[PDB]
Structure formats: structure tokens, C-alpha cells
Amino acid sequence: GLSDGEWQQVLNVWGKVEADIAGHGQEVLIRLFTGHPETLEKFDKFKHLKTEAEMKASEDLKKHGTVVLTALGGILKKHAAHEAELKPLAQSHATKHKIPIKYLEFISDAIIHVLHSKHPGDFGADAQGAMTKALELFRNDIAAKYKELGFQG
Template identity: 45%
Template sequence: MGYKKDSTDEGGTNQAENILGQPRRILFQALQIMADYDMILKHWGPVEADYSTYGNLVLTRLFTEHPETQKLFPKFVSIPHGDLAGNAAVSAHGATVLKKLGELLKAKGNHAAILKPLSNSHATKHKIPINNFRLISEVIVKVMAEKAGLDGAGQQALRSVMAVVIADMDANYKELGYAG
């Protein structure tokens, strides 16, 4: 069935606009997410220059604001909250987390090859529930706002990007049969 230039559906909407609207919307969303990556990466330099310090800030805050998350890290379980900030192992693991996030950000959405093994290890070996990625994402947003100058628009961009990453991780979790 062909569409006439002036044909409309029952609601009076031009059918050609309906057909073209979806690709335009997808294109707009793709352009927006690319702009989000660029905005975040503009503020990533200080983090990249000192992964250990930022990593410690992120994990210390995560464990302080969400104490239940500390139990998911066997090597950190016995560290009192007051000792987290000065702990080298916390800094090292935080640095690892942020380096991986940096890789994901620089991939600008083309992250399947990075995310698949990460999802696999966190689902099958570490058994990390997907909600914990939402928690740490929000902590990263706060730390970047306070320490790396990420403004309100940048914070929203980071939340949007992390929502995509977490949704992709969740899809990987489901493929693996992990309900986390």
C-alpha cells in the first residue's frame, strides 16, 4: 500500500510523518547520547589523571552511603568505615572501576566488547546485583560534580549514559540467566 502525500490516519496525523518520525527520533536520540559522551569526557581529565584518588572517593562514598554494598567485596568487608579513605586496596580497586568506566565512555556506545566480559564476571563470579551499578553510578555523578566540576547538564548526561550501559549489562545478565 502506498501513501499519498496528503493521506492522514484516523487522528489526522500525516502518515508519511509517522513513518519518518521514528527514524528521526532514533537519530535525535543517537546524536543526544553522543553529545552526552562528549560532555562527560570533557570533565574526565582530572579523573584520568588520578584514578586512585577518585576511585577511593567513589568506593568510600558508596560503602558509606550504601553499607550493604561493602559486603559484596570480600576483601573490604572487615575494613571499618573510618579506615576506607586511607586504604590502598580500596584506592586500587576504585582505580580499576574508573579505568573501566573510562574505556566505556571513550567507546561512546560501541561498548559490547568491553561490557560483555565485565557483565559475565560480575554476574557469574562476583554475583553483583544490577542495582548496585545504579548505586555506584549515582555516587560517581556526585563525586564528579564535587571534584571534577561536572555541572547539572553534565550530571544528567552521565546519568543518561550510565542508564544505557546498565541496561546493556542487564541484558547481558539475562542472557547469562542471572537475575541480579
């Protein structure tokens, strides 16, 4: 995994990419296509491009480069944001409050029953099934953080 600090280094480095996204995008696809010519074969738009000079002159290659780095930036920002909520809760619950992972299942069951009780209009058998799965996914993600911090279970 990455620490708090490492995710912030990644987002700071991505700040630099985003500052010249056109140039960064072009150079990434030129590097990909010159380093690994086989990757060209996936692209109807580009598979006939032979040289770095031909690639630097391609307006469509520059546009596609921007699209790739924009999408990757969005995915890394959302990954980092999830980790940023997750890690502090795992860290406090595992190292300070000393909560075993199994207790997260008990509070998950309690949250489901209180939602059902208080909001039955908003929370049917479908919503309850979906919420049960969502809280299991949450527990799996905290459990992964627990493992990194030296707790299994």
C-alpha cells in the first residue's frame, strides 16, 4: 500500500502533469508507441504511425494523450480520497481504540436494523440486501488496513 504522505506526493506529482496535460499526454503515448510498438495495433486512429516525428505531428495522438491522463488523474484522485477516509479510521480503531475487526460486523448489523426500524419506507428488502453488501465491502477495506498495521482477523 501507500502511506498518507505517499498519496499526497502522488497527487502533487499529478498537479504537475495537469499543469501541462497536452504535452504530458503526447509524450506518454509517443513513449508507449516507440518503446512498445505492438501497443499501436490496438488503435485504428494511430496503428499506421511509424516514427516519433509522425507521432509528434498527430493532432489526434495529442488529444488522446490528454484524455488518457485526465481519466487516470480522476481514478487516482478517487483512489486517494477513499484511502484518505479509510486509513485514519483503521489507524485509530486498530492502534488507539483497540477494536477487533469482528466488532465492525456487530455495529454493521446494528446500523442495518436501526435504518430498517426508523426508515422502513426508505429501506426495503432490496435496500437492506444492498446495504448489507456495502457494509461487508467497508469491513473488507478496514480489514486490509488492519493487516498493514499488523492485525489479522
